[PDB]
Design a protein around this ligand. Structure first.
Ligand SMILES: [Ca+2]
Lengths: 541, 215
């Protein structure tokens, strides 16, 4: 045996999204560790390696594996796998027709009512789904999603009255989860002062991460496929309450002040930025940076209700001048794009193509009908992006990404039991197509249409991409100047505090601890009371 | 609609266990589709194993099982064509396990959720022993170093026929006190086959082209 030291270069916190249990966690971790190992010259037993966790199993019916390290699976990894979700109260479980599962992985709607809630606190990992939002103030909302007369779509649900769109519970579980994250960061800084804290968020989790930045900003923030929108779309007008319809200047100021709060931590006692890589590029100290990763095929973030920065990034003005937010947040705000026929990690460009992707194909993968184009409208004519992010030693050629925007593998009719559709069994792996099915299905017509070939939505493509993390994001991470031989069980305590199934009293009892709204989060409502009626009248038709 | 009938290529071996036992891919348009059958000329066996091409598995496979009634074969999805691509969770490869000779088939999922089912196989080793099968997933960057070992063994209490044995890591001195990181690294030359075949191979020359539908 040969027992080497840890010496990690800054901790990383993975923040998942909605109805997600960190699917992209494992193999963003693997790729990012390999990228760091090449970037910093680590080799042999000294190199970093990913953790390995226990997989799922049958009891049959799928069960999410226990969040425990597998035998001999503890590796040299700086990843803190954060987790969050929503738990039902001790007496108010089935008021919200939303998916619910216990820790052991049992469907609430599959057990007798008298047995239900005897034990196994009911919850859903990552929070409902129909409850996202495009601003930070809505995380403190006393009111959940209301379905009463496209609004809040999130794939995993048929398109073209209101099946699964039951009225969602209040959104405190967002802000509360953000407070937990803002705890862990500050908790890390208490235990460890000269190390680096990186937050790596996805989907709705970005808001949670962003809210923790306004409380305790980390040394680096990464937002992948964020629902943050600097303008209130008509759907935002008709859905959100008057209190949570935030003005354009206020949303931009909120983001800018969060980037400044994160950029505050760019001065520490002095990797060595006196290093030039094998490709002639200078290694960069990425302290206090905030990175926006966008996917131009995101069927969730490109949909007309959102059209957020996780899809279009920070687009350019009508005359080519870069986005106004760049000057607001300063020189520590960066943007990267990951789409088909588009280089990622190359030389920075001023007007990077967005609406004309450059291969003749339409902007939207197989979007032809009037309703489909109404749900996913093409971006404005000639929209452009600034990619001010640095270059990487091995960037992604547009030819490598010519196949990156997925589509219907086969949209023919399905047999009923042996096919490739939601509630079926992949005839190759003998495994269900989509597992969540069971925790969702709760004459046969409707249940007989539970074979809708769900359209691939390029939402998890960006975080799961091995090439993007290993060759771009790895170099985009900051590294503290003085590494620290890490602690035996201290780091495991951090992971325990991250997993809310192991430390959140909200999961054990239900005691929400909602933090107050930080000063960086503005609540300046736009004069929209009349404008809400304008969009409301159109729905009457 | 008025579909034209497809032409399939001739059966070709993609993993040769030995002289008598071999895996044949047949009823296919190219090396990334079709079905894979298990063949034993002595017992005159010809049963289906995968409804997909076994060439997608780019890892290594070491067949030490002498039993024609227990079969385990890696079910790997195609990155370019699969219904789980783009899905918010991704894809998950698995192994097809039969304990009745091939009539009843079951699927044991392994690995992590990914957007590259074939790309994950390039990091895997799989041993098929008489008593079950072992999967080694290599961690780190370059090289096949620092593996995590997952072991499955026969049981009659489960529908699959196999269940995970926690007592794995018997590949390297079964009393060596496995640590938290886990044996950097492990030698499999004791399992290296006599014919020196480890990866799945396919001959694209037998892929049948067809110039149909000029308009
Ligand atoms: Ca797609």
């Amino acid at each position: 045996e040969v027992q080497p030291p840890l010496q990690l270069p800054g901790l990383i916190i993975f923040v998942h999204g909605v109805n997600s249990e960190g699917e992209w966690y494992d193999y963003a971790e693997r790729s990012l560790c390999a990228g760091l190992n090449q970037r910093l010259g680590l080799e042999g037993e000294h190199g970093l390696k990913e953790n390995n966790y226990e997989g799922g199993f049958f009891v049959k019916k799928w069960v999410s594996g226990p969040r425990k390290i597998t035998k001999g699976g503890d590796g040299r990894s700086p990843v803190i796998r954060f987790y969050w979700g929503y738990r039902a109260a001790d007496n108010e479980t089935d008021t919200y027709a939303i998916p619910l599962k216990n820790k052991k992985g049992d469907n609430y709607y599959d057990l007798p009512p008298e047995s239900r809630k005897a034990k196994g606190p009911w919850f859903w990992g990552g929070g409902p789904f129909q409850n996202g939002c495009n601003q930070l103030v809505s995380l403190w909302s006393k009111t959940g999603f209301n379905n009463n007369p496209v609004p809040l779509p999130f794939s995993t649900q048929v398109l073209n009255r209101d099946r699964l769109l039951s009225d969602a519970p209040p959104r405190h579980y967002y802000a509360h989860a953000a407070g937990r994250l803002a705890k862990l960061i500050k908790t890390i800084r208490n235990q460890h002062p000269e190390d680096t804290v990186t937050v790596l968020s996805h989907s709705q989790g970005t808001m949670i991460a962003l809210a923790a930045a306004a409380i305790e900003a980390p040394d680096a923030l990464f937002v992948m496929n964020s629902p943050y929108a600097l303008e209130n779309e008509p759907t935002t007008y008709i859905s959100y309450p008057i209190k949570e319809i935030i003005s354009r200047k206020a949303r931009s100021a909120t983001f800018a002040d969060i980037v400044k709060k994160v950029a505050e931590n760019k001065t520490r006692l002095k990797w060595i930025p006196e290093g030039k890589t094998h490709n002639g590029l200078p290694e960069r100290d990425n302290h206090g940076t905030t990175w926006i990763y966008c996917n131009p095929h995101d069927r969730v973030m490109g949909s007309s209700p959102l059209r957020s920065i996780g899809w279009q990034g920070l687009p350019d003005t009508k005359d080519g001048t870069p986005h106004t937010l760049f000057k607001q947040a300063g020189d520590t705000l960066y943007v990267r794009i990951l789409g088909r026929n588009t280089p990622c990690g190359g030389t920075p460009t001023a007007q990077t193509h967005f609406s004309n992707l450059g291969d003749g194909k339409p902007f939207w993968d197989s979007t032809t009908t009037l309703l489909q184009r109404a749900t996913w409208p093409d971006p404005d004519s000639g929209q452009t992006l600034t990619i001010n992010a640095p270059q990487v030693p091995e960037p992604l050629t547009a030819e490598e990404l010519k196949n990156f925007d997925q589509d219907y593998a086969r949209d023919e009719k399905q047999s009923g039991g042996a096919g490739y559709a939601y509630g079926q069994i992949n005839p190759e792996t003998k495994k269900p197509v989509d597992t969540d099915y069971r925790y969702y299905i709760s004459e046969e017509m409707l249940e007989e249409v539970r074979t809708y070939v769900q359209r691939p939505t390029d939402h998890s493509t960006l975080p799961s991409d091995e090439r993007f993390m290993s060759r771009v994001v790895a170099y985009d991470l900051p590294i503290g100047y003085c590494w620290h031989s890490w602690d035996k069980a201290g780091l495991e305590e951090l992971r325990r505090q991250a997993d809310w199934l192991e430390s959140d009293d909200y999961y054990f009892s239900g005691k929400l601890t909602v933090p107050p709204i930080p000063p960086a989060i503005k609540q300046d409502v736009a004069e929209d009371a009349e404008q809400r009626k304008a969009e409301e009248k159109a729905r009457l038709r | 609609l008025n579909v034209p009938p497809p032409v399939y290529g001739p059966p070709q071996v993609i993993f040769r266990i030995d002289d008598n036992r071999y895996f044949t891919l047949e009823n296919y348009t190219h090396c990334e589709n079709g079905q894979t059958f298990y063949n034993n000329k002595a017992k005159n066996i010809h049963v289906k194993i995968l409804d997909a091409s076994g060439y997608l598995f780019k890892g290594r496979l070491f067949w030490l099982s002498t039993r024609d009634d227990f079969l385990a074969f890696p079910a790997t999805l195609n990155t370019r064509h699969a219904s789980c691509m783009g899905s918010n969770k991704g894809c998950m490869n698995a192994v097809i396990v039969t304990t009745d000779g091939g009539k009843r088939r079951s699927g044991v999922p392994y690995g992590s959720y990914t957007q590259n089912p074939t790309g994950a196989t390039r990091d895997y080793d799989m041993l098929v022993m008489n008593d079950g099968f072992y999967l080694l997933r290599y961690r780190g960057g370059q090289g096949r170093f620092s593996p995590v070992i997952l072991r499955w063994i026969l049981s009659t209490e489960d529908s699959s026929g196999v269940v995970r044995s926690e007592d794995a890591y018997e590949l390297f001195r079964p009393g060596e006190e496995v640590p938290s990181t886990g044996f950097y690294k492990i030698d499999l030359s004791r399992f290296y086959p006599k014919n020196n075949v480890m990866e799945m191979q396919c001959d694209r020359t037998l892929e049948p082209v067809q110039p149909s539908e000029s308009k």
